[model samples]
Target: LHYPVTRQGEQVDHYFGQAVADPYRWLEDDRSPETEAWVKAQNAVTQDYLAQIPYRAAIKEKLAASWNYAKEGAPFWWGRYHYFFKNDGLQNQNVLWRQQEGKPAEVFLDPNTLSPDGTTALDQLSFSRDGRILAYSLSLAGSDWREIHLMDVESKQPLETPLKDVKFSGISWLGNEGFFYSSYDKPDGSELSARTDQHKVYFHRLGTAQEDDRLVFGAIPAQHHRYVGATVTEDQRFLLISAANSTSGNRLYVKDLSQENAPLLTVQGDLDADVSLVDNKGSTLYLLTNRDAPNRRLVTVDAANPGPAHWRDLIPERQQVLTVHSGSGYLFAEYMVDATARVEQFDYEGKRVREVALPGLGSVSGFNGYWWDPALYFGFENYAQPPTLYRFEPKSGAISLYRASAAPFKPEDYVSEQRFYQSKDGTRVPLIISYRKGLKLDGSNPTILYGYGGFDVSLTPSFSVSVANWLDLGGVYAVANLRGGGEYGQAWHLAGTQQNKQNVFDDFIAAAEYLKAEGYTRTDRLAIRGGSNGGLLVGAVMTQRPDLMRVALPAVGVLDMLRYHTFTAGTGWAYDYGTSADSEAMFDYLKGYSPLHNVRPGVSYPSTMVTTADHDDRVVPAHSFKFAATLQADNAGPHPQLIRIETNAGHGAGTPVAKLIEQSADIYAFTLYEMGYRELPRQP
Candidate 1:
């Protein structure tokens, strides 16, 4: 197959007196028509090649079948009404519904109607303290930039105007009068790829213009933060502010809103560790932090004497990783023991109560409510099982199933097993392999090994229709909880960052070898995939060991490590990946494993399909374009080098379900067709 001719440039950059050539630099111009046509030409080849595959349509059918199910979110109460989200099978967006006492449920807001093409997405529903007014934020075509709209809750009528140009922000309502939000000024260049720094917090009055919103924080340039968020106490007596330059840790501040001319006091003056205001009992503030504990712990401090030295341990950290949530005037502590979940309840005095019995080996979320609420909700699921919502009573320790997923895939015939493997440096790593039961120990099975070992993210077991379809096709799905993740704690994450990033790749590589050695699948039948930082994981490992797998799927990856920090919010990630400008040794270390810089001229790289979206302002699609151009130019193998660029999409959140299904269908078809299969291993 003949590929399109990509014009090369003489672009070069000097970092620490080191000269590097970037030939495909023209592709970085996201707004140029030349780049637009280049994307069109590349996608034409990919779509044409995927169309000729024998079982592409069949794979799509199975994906849609597995995806056709009714799903619902746990309900929350506000004033006299309860709100929840419900998605009918195969809908583009979930519809929000509100029900009062005995009244029939009505559509509170239908995001599908927000756009004719159904690409506009809804986020952050913040109701006023009185619940008489509701504020919701929406984004267009999956972009991170959002606009907030308000409405009268009882009449279902929108307010005068909406607030615009919001990003990476949280909405906290002070009362029926006004609320607090955070955002940057409108960027001068293309909003999709331009650099944005200096986030600020503002308070917007209910009936005022967006420009009249009072600047609350981040007004001074020297005190600028990469991310700033504000939250008001439930009692409305105190306003909490969190400032962070990077993604890991923060500096906290609190202002007594109950008093006029009240000064904002500093709680944490430095970004040494993570801290956040969890709750308050009159003047006593409950704070969660990882300053002393690798796993997190809850501490108590008085409002007037809030400091690291004045803190007292409330619920001390244990061997397992802990996350605290509040409901029914009690704290719910969820511990991650070996990547699964265990729950225990405690009062304000840190006195432990009964342990809430979970259904099975799975992750749990939700246990959220107000102080006076009587009941709370949570969801539990594993790799093979669908998430089931449960209602629990805090006073009596009683639990009951609220809703069971209606996905067509029967989970009883499937099994999920956990095992440990040794990495390159002898560090023990955890892997969860889920598949249909009664599987033989044969190396002929098609397998996909997936991982994301960065940003303190965890690969906890959760069910998705895409994995369900893969399992139905007689394929094996495996997840590796590698180092840069939060499975073990902050210690696990720090071990795989900066100069230690290679441990993530080493752990992932070892998992693939373990699969082949233990008879899960052979090298020719295996594939590795991940996204974003995980995308970087797949990119680096495939470049380092090209003979380990048949295919490589890196979606929206930061392939160009040397220049990653120059893009939007990429600088905040410097704590995990040191930039090339940091030091001479740091530049050398980054260049050693950087995927874009490491691609060689005569190597047989894996059959690669790099994916990114046009509106991916978070990571930007230029990373994939340059990598794809480099692969097409120099790869010596006959395997296909392709890029699937999705139009009107961002970095994987709030995407239309139709686009998601089509994307996965194309991916599964490509994976199997390249693995010596003319048709799917099993029929839908």
Candidate 2:
């Protein structure tokens, strides 16, 4: 099949004395008719090719079947009711259900009712302390832009007009009187692709117009903050304000809400360290920070003098990375030991309470509850096991299974283990490999190597039906705990950021090399996949070492690093990417490894399938479009370079189950086809 013709523009951007040709610059304008036509043509070609795969129907059926299981979240107590989210087999969106303790649950919020296509999803939901008022935000077509709705919990009546222009903010309630939220001025042009900056925090009283809401922070022009958020203490005595330039570090400030016209007091004024309020006892505030310790530690400081000098360590740093949550008047410090969860509880005075027992080896999330609440609820799961909910009694220090998942897959049939490998720079990294038991050690297995090495995010073990299907199909799945993630600590994250960003690519390459060296899979049978930052990882690695893998799946990747910071909230990513305008050295470094700029002509690149969505305002589809155009124009081999564009979908959040099944089927079929497999394993 012939590739669609992509018209090139004469646009050129000069960065640090170098003129870079942006031949497909016109593709960036998503609102353009030409781009729309190009998208239709590209989709037709991709769909035609995908329809030819014989087992595509079978794979889709398997995915839909395996995915048809009831999924529920841990129940939490709110006011006089217990609330939880439940999704019946194959529901596009989860429904929020609530009930009085020991009573039958009823639907409180149904996202399926908001849209006919199930594309409108509930993003953030917060309730008042009294539970009489509810604040929920909705995202249409998976866009970041949210429309917050307020309603009376008892009568279920609307409290105000839907709050508009909210993004990258949480609905934090101050009390029954009002709540706090962050937003930007509505963009003049397309809301999907416009550049947004100067995030502001506002407090909205019930029944008041959005325009009448009081501005709490981020209004000054001179002190422009990229992201601003406000959270009130449980006691309603202190209001905590956090300001950040990016997703990483932030400056924390506290306000005495009890006093009239009180000034915002600095807890940590600089954006060098990450400090978050855990809880407060009277005037003493507990915090988690990595200021002096890379692995993070819990500390306490008097609200009267909350500074580094006045801060006292309550729980000192340990070898493992730390994340803390407060509940039942106890600090639950979750430590990440080689990307696995190990939770320990402590008192407000820093005395060790007891280690929270977990169900075998898996990820544990949710212990959120009120300080006076009797018990906490959490979810546990591994690669093979579905997520099961459990209740923890603080007084008795016992965990009881509340809701167990009964998925079709059998855990006993799978084998999961961790292995450590040395990177190019001799740094040791952990890799988790999972597959069906009794697999051969021969290098003929079809392997999928996945990784994400940026933005302090950790790739931990979790249940996925798609992965289970892959394992059943005689394919080996491996996840590399690469740097630039919270797996280790801040030090690990920094090793893959800014000028050292190339380390991420190197780490991922070494993982592929290690798999090949260990006789698990050969280059031709190995596939690489990652989304978002991981997308960037795969893109960079393929351009740097195209011979490493056979199939390359870069989904919603930031391909053009030079122009990335120009889009909506992309400027906030400067802490990790270091924009082209930062410095000449930074520009040179970014261009050196940028996937769009590194595509060389006459190169036999791997069979590539670049995936992105139309409504993706996060990384923007322009990144995928330009990169695919460049790869198609520069390819010199028979390998296919194609892009799969989905309509009415943003980055990846709130995607319908139907859409997910279709995407997974297409991707798996493409991967298998490119690896020279004529059909899938009969059992899978």
Candidate 3:
């Protein structure tokens, strides 16, 4: 297949005395006429090929049927009413619903009505102490930049003028008078692509203009905080600030809002570790930190002297990674043990209350609520199940099923199992394999090996409508908890990053090798997939060893490693994958692995669909565009090298249901088709 557009090597930069050329440099600008033409032509080819698949329509229909279920989010009290999000099958976005006492549950907010194109999405929500005022933020066209909106909780009317240009923020209300949010100065170029290097937390009063909002943190440019977050305590007594220069760690500061012009106190003088205030009790602060402990631990200290020296371990770190949540006067210690959740309840006094009995293995979220909350709600799900909401008795450690998943998937018909495998470096990695039960371990099974081994992100088992369809097609789905993930702890994450980045690839490569060796699937029947950093994973792996899998899906990836940091919020990720500008060795290292840079001429790469969106400001569509352009430019023996660039969408969050279904249909269709399947497989 011929490429839509082509460019010859024109630009070069010397890295360690080596000239590296980038030809698709023009595709970096979305507003450029050449780029606009390039996008549609590329997209047209992808659609043309996908449209040719006979089972594409059937896959979409089946996906819609499975996805057409009443989905409800766990309920939480917001001011005058307890609210939950619900979608009756195929709504563009989940509608916010509310109820109180004998009142009927009714729609509070419908994000679908916010955008005609179904591109506007609700990003953040916060309520005042009294729960009377609601502070929420919305993003349009998937832009990370947000606009804050205020609403009266009881009347459900717009409360104030919306604040604009906020990005990477946490909305925290200071009673009903004001709130704090973080944002960077508007970039001169495209807001979607221009660099947003530093952040400032601002205090916005009820009647004040955003221009007049007080700068609470990161006021000095010297601080150079790339991401600044400020949150008010539930009691409205202290304002805590977490300033992070990179994605690595943060420096924390605090101020006594209860006192008159209280001096800002430094909890940690510098960005040495990741720390956050979880909860507080009468000048005694409870914090979760990974200072001396890689797994994280809960520490309590006097609010007046909240420093490491004065801190006492409340709930010490253990073998498993810890994530604590506060609700009903209880500290719920949720640990990630080998990628599975285990919840243990504790009191503020460091007293072990009990290990809260979870519904089953998978992932659990919730058990968090206000001190006065009568009960808390939690969610549980695994590869074979959708999130089932449950009501929990904090006092009794009892679990009551509130609402089970309504997805068409029947739990008993499928099997989800966990096992360990060895990496090339002798590291034992956890792998979750899910498929229909009673399946023969045949090498003929169409299989997808998925991984995302960076950013301290643990690849835990979670059910998705898309993946469910894949399994229903008599296929296998495997997720590898490789190095650089927080599956074990920070200790496990460090080794998968920077100079040791190849460990992530080696781990994934071994994951595929294990499946082939065990007669699960062979290279001809296998596909490798990931998104974001995982996109980087698929890209690097496919280039390094084109024969690993038959299909490759890299979505919204950071493909241009040499200049990834020059884009919006891309610099924030430098701590994870060091920038090429850092050193000659760094440039050469990234050069050796960058998917866009590492493509070899005449190598028969896997049937690849480089997916991205024009509006994805986080990773930017340029990464996808450049990679596809270069890959297509190189005579990589193509089964088909195509780029699917969706329109008016940002990074993978808050996408419309219709769009998601369509995309997943295309992805599945592309995967199975590339694997030489003339027809969709039937479920046993």
Candidate 4:
């Protein structure tokens, strides 16, 4: 197959004393007609190859069948209404619904009607203190920028004025009067690719215009913060402000809203630690922090004199990483032990209640509510188990199943297990392997090993219809809890960040090797895949060790590390990926393993499919565009090197079901076809 002729430009940059040439720099101008034609030509080549695969249609049908299942979230009460979200088998977006104690559930907000093709999605929803009003945000084509709309819950009428340019914000209601939100100034150039660094908080009162909204914090020339968020207390007495330049650490400040002209008190002034408000009792504020404990601990401090020195430990750190939630006047701490979950309960006084019993080894989430709420809900699931919701009564200590997955999944037919493997540097890493229970341990299985080892995000066991369908197709799925995740704690996360980022690649490589060494799969039958940061993982690993896998799927990856921080909110990720302008050492380190830079000439790389969306302003499609052009030019192998550019899609947050199914089918078909399959195997 003849690839498109990607025209190169004479663009170069000198990092310190080293000159770096970016020949495909013209692709970065996403608005140019030349770039558009380049994209269209590449898509033609990709679709032409995909269309030739005989089993592609059958794979799509199977994926659609597997995906057609009812999915629902646990219900929570707000005011007199009990609300939850549900997606009726293959709906573009989940619809928000509300019901009384015994009344029928009715749709409150159907996101599907907001757009013709279901590209506009409901991003966030926050109710007023009394639940009389609801402020929700909507995203178009999966972009991070959202618009906040206010509605009268009883009347179901939207307010005349709407908030615009809001991105990466949390809506916090300060009583029924107004709410606080964060956003950067509307860019002077393209909203999709422009650099935005200053983020500010504003309080919008009901019946007032957006321009009249009070500036709560941030946007000051003296104290510039890349990210600033405001959260009001349940009692409406205090407002908490968290300011950060990057994602990792924040400096916290608390404002006494009840007092006239009350000075904003500094809880933590240094942006060296993470501190967040858990719950507050009058002046006493409970916080979850990793300041002194990497695994996190709960501490109490008075609002008037809150500081790191004056804090008192409520719950000390344990072996596992702790995440705290409050409801029914009790604090529930969810601990992550080797990427699995354990829950423990405590009273407001910090006295230990019993450990909440879980069903088995899996991930648990959602234990959120107000102080006086009688009961709270949590959901649990593994790779083989669909989400099962349970309601826990704080007073009686009774736990009962509220809802089970309506999906036609047989958990008994499959099995999942956790195993520890040693990395190249002798560091222990956890890998969760899931497949059919009776599959023989042979090196001939079609295996898809997945990983995302960055941004302090943990890869926990969660059920996915796409993964389940892969297992049904006699495929083995493995997930590696590599070093850059929050599985073990801060130390584990930092171990894979910045200069230590290579450790994440080493850990992922070790997992792939372990699978082959254990007789589960050979290099010919193995495929590696990951999205976002994990996409970076796949690109890095595949470029370094192309013989480890036959096919590579890096979806929306950060391929060009040098110019990454110059786009959108990419600068805020500098903590995890040190910028090219940071130092000579940093620039040298980034240039060493950056997938786009490291794609050398005359190397027989694996059959690669790089994916990016046109509307993806978060990472920007230029990463994939430049990488694919470079790979196509430098390839010496017969394997197909293609890029699938999705239209009207952003960074995969609110993508429609039809698009998701199509993407998964295309991916699976490509993987199988390249792994030497002539046709798909017949179903049992």
* Candidate number of the best lDDT: 4
Across 1-684, the per-residue lDDT of candidate 4 in tens digits comes to 989999889999888878999999999888899999999999999999999998899889988877788889988788899888999888988899999877888999899989999999998789998888999999989989999999999888887677999999999998888899999999988799889999999999888899999988886685589999999998989999999999899999999989999999999999888999999999999999999999999999999999999999999999899999998889999999889999899998899998999988899988888887888899999999999999999888999999988987799999898899999999999999999887877899899999999888999899998899899988999999999999989999999999999999999999999999999999999999999888889889988998889999999999999999999989999999999999989998999889999998999999999999999999999999999999999989989999999999999999999899999999999999999899774461
Clash number by candidate, in order: 0, 0, 1, 0
Q: Cα lDDT of all candidates, in order?
A: 0.91, 0.91, 0.88, 0.92
Query: What is the number of residue pairs that collide in model 1?
Result: 0
Error of 4 at 402 (Å): 0.6
CA shift of 89, model 3, Å: 0.7
Off by over 4 Å in 4: 682-684
Candidate 1 vs candidate 3, TM-score winner? 1
Candidate 1 residues 1-684, lDDT tens each? 778899999999999787999999889889899999999999999999998897989888878877888999999899899999999988898999999998999999999998987799998989998899998899888988999899999998999788898998888998788899999888888888888888899999977898999999997985699899999999999999999999899999989888899888888888988998878999899888898998989999988868789989999988888888988999998899889999999998999998999999988989878898889999998888898999999999999999988878787989889999999999999999988887777898899999999888888889888997898899999999999999998999999999999999999999999999999899999999999998899889988998999999999999999988888888999999999998998899999999999899999998989999998988989999999999999899988889999988899889999999999999999999889898788877
CA RMSD per model (angstroms): 0.9, 1.2, 1.3, 1.2
Each prediction's TM-score against the native? 0.99, 0.98, 0.98, 0.98
Best TM-score among the predictions, by candidate number: 1
What does candidate 3's lDDT look like per residue over 407-475, in tens digits? 888978899888899998799999999998977887888999999998899987788988888888988
Q: List the residue pairs that clash in candidate 2.
A: none
